[PDB]
Design a protein around this ligand. Structure first.
Ligand SMILES: O=S(=O)(O)C[C@H]1CNC[C@@H](O)[C@@H]1O
Ligand SMILES: [Ca+2]
Length: 670
């Protein structure tokens, strides 16, 4: 279970026969040192550099047997040392606790042994890679980037005035947790800046900007079993409300009458509609970016007259109303004033209230480390959204904490920055828990951190461009779902049609309908107008568009019994709803390299069309008896090509599924 072999100051550590650590004087496992962080932010985009002062290999290791395991004193002369404790924890997990000699040694580099053939998955929500082997991954929550690839034109345009284009590793939800194909997970407790480097064939290197580190590992015989264990450590999500399965949630702005009119147009045309999502429930702010929300979390009766009574009528017709909140407060409005009066805002170095620039306006940061401010903001949600009758909301942002804020708990903003998303999620979760609404109300988040696996009821993929790019278009959503599934979050959707509308990018009708085909094979369907609604093709753009939504929402609703079962398994044991093919086909080597296809539950395989102008699509089937959803044709394992016009996405089901007869009914929809 634990094999430590000591000897010339050299050792190895095996754990359930996996080699975890090796150390000798010539090949050390540990370096320590110091640096001065050089971090700046503009509008959520961060520039991060180290001024590295020292990096020193600790070649001398003195070992002793301990109360619960082994203690290693590492050093390089008397002046430079650290201690490592090796134990089991309360549940049998390997526990490594590292503490440097003093606080001035604020850098660590730790190497873990690896094999050249190993694949690595997770690190939160990753949009450019699913398998992480071969590259390094900085872990710092931020804006996710527009374009995200230096070689593409839009990324270059987003970089022109502002550091906004980003790169392959930028994300709203990085997490210091990964899975190896030696069938273990590694979880790090720290929230400091970290870089997890998976590029060397013989070792993984974990770099931390702190004087201590805590890591836990567990193994298992299958990936399914490993995810059950990972979610028993980090959390499991609740079952979704029953109405999520009942149709599409329409994203609409412009007030009570506009919402009513668009609702009737779609319902009257045969579309299954379960909800209206109106982010402008609190008012609007026009900026050069386009149409934004007014960040003051109170119902605006000028934009939305009679909303309270109108929600009661919509609910009797089987339609829910969903709103919008974030953990910041516009500086020109009432809630910010109320928070300043009480001292509820994050401060600057001089003790004044810190105002962040959010894109042509300013806002305060509600200090969620102050228990009274956190209680106050939870009451804002309960009184202004739950009591109004909202069935859910977008719970946005979490990524913008500057490193020169000062917080009520006295912990550096260099450490609290990455921890803010799960603190925000917990605020939402407890609002629901204290009003008895878990399983009835649904909120959805884009940002996350350790513990969002418990506290976030649903993830969405944040802001994609209204384009076909691999790094920031429709395609990018699949690695995002898969990476999070491997980090213990199994409920994921996207904006139908994407969001970011800039430069020459504008949403075509073809993009909207292909994205609709994709989302009908996920656990939630919800549209978005985008930041410039007049430049994008919308769900009611023409009769053909409306009819495509009626067909594909009939497809999604038909799947209800199946999806409900999958969501219940995710709640019970962390078995995610959208699954990497290797969860069920562990001996197929080729499945470990796929990024753009997934299993929906156990029995459906989906390979979404993510390129413009296609009439067919090529994909990989693992070895099983498959049936093409739309033709009923039989297929076996191998590379295959199928016809794929709009409305017939590349979808296959297992012939031997207990659900085969439900899936066979799909080809008879109009
Ligand atoms: O423009 S707003 O900041 O108010 C709201 C948008 C930003 N976050 C993600 C988008 O989906 C929202 O519409
Ligand atoms: Ca983006």
């Amino acid at each position: 279970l634990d094999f430590q072999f000591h000897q010339n100051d050299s050792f190895t550590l095996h754990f359930q026969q996996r080699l975890i650590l090796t150390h000798s004087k010539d090949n050390p496992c540990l370096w320590i040192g110091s640096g001065i962080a050089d971090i700046d932010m503009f509008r959520g985009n961060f520039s991060i550099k180290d001024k590295l002062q020292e990096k020193i290999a600790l070649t001398d290791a003195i070992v002793s047997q301990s109360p619960d395991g082994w203690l290693i004193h590492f050093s390089r002369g008397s002046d430079i040392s650290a201690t490592l404790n090796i134990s089991a924890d309360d549940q049998g997990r390997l526990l490594l606790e590292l503490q440097n000699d003093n606080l001035n040694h604020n850098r660590i580099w730790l190497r873990l042994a690896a094999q050249p053939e190993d694949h690595i998955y997770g690190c939160g929500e990753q949009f450019s890679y699913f398998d992480l082997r071969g590259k390094p991954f900085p872990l710092w929550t931020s804006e996710q980037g527009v374009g995200r690839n230096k070689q593409t034109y839009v990324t270059w345009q987003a970089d022109c005035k502002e550091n906004a284009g980003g790169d392959y590793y930028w994300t709203f939800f990085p997490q210091p947790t990964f899975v190896s194909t030696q069938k273990y997970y590694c979880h790090v407790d720290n929230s400091c800046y970290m870089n997890f480097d998976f590029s060397a064939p013989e070792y993984h290197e974990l770099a931390l900007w702190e004087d201590k580190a805590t890591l836990r590992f567990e193994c298992a015989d299958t990936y399914i079993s490993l995810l059950e264990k990972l979610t028993a450590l980090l959390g499991r999500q609740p079952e979704l409300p029953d109405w999520i399965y009942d149709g599409v949630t329409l994203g609409i702005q412009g007030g009570t009458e506009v919402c009513q009119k668009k609702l009737d147009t779609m319902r009257n045309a045969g579309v299954k509609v379960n909800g209206i999502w109106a982010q402008d429930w609190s008012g609007i702010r026009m900026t050069s970016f386009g149409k934004r929300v007014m960040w003051n979390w109170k119902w605006n009766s000028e934009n939305y007259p009679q909303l309270d009574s109108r929600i009661k009528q919509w609910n009797q017709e089987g339609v829910q109303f969903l709103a919008y909140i974030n953990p910041y407060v516009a500086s020109d409005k009432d809630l910010c004033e109320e928070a300043a009066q009480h001292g509820y805002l994050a401060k600057d170095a001089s003790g004044g209230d810190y105002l962040v620039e959010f894109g042509e306006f300013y806002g305060g940061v509600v200090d969620l480390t102050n228990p009274e401010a956190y209680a106050w903001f939870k009451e804002v949600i309960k009184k202004n959204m739950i009591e109004l009758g909202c069935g859910g909301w977008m719970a946005d942002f979490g990524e913008y904490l500057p490193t020169d804020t000062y917080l009520h708990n006295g912990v550096s903003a260099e450490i609290m920055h990455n921890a803010w998303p799960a603190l925000w999620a917990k605020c939402n979760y407890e609002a629901l828990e204290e009003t008895g609404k878990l399983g009835e109300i649904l909120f959805f988040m884009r940002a996350g951190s350790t513990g969002s696996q418990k506290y976030s009821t649903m993830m969405w993929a944040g802001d994609q461009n209204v384009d076909w790019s691999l790094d920031d278009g429709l395609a990018s959503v699949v690695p995002a779902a898969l990476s999070l599934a491997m980090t213990g979050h199994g409920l994921h959707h996207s904006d139908i049609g994407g969001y970011t509308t800039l430069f020459e990018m504008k949403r075509s009708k073809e993009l909207l309908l292909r994205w609709c085909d994709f989302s009908a094979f996920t656990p939630m369907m919800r549209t978005h107008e985008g930041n410039r609604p007049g430049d994008n093709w919308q769900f009611d753009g023409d009769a053909e568009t409306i009819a495509h939504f009626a067909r594909m929402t009939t497809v999604f609703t038909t799947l209800k019994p199946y999806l409900k079962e999958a969501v219940a398994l995710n709640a019970k044991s962390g078995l995610p709803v959208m699954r990497p093919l290797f969860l069920h086909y562990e001996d197929d080597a080729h499945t470990y390299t796929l990024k753009y296809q997934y299993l929906l539950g156990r029995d459906i395989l989906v390979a979404p069309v993510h390129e413009e102008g296609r009439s067919d699509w090529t994909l990989y089937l693992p070895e099983d008896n498959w049936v093409h959803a739309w033709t009923g044709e039989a297929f076996r394992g191998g590379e295959v090509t199928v016809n794929a016009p709009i409305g017939k996405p590349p979808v296959f089901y297992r012939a031997d599924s207990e659900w085969a007869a439900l899936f066979a009914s799909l080809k008879s929809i109009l």
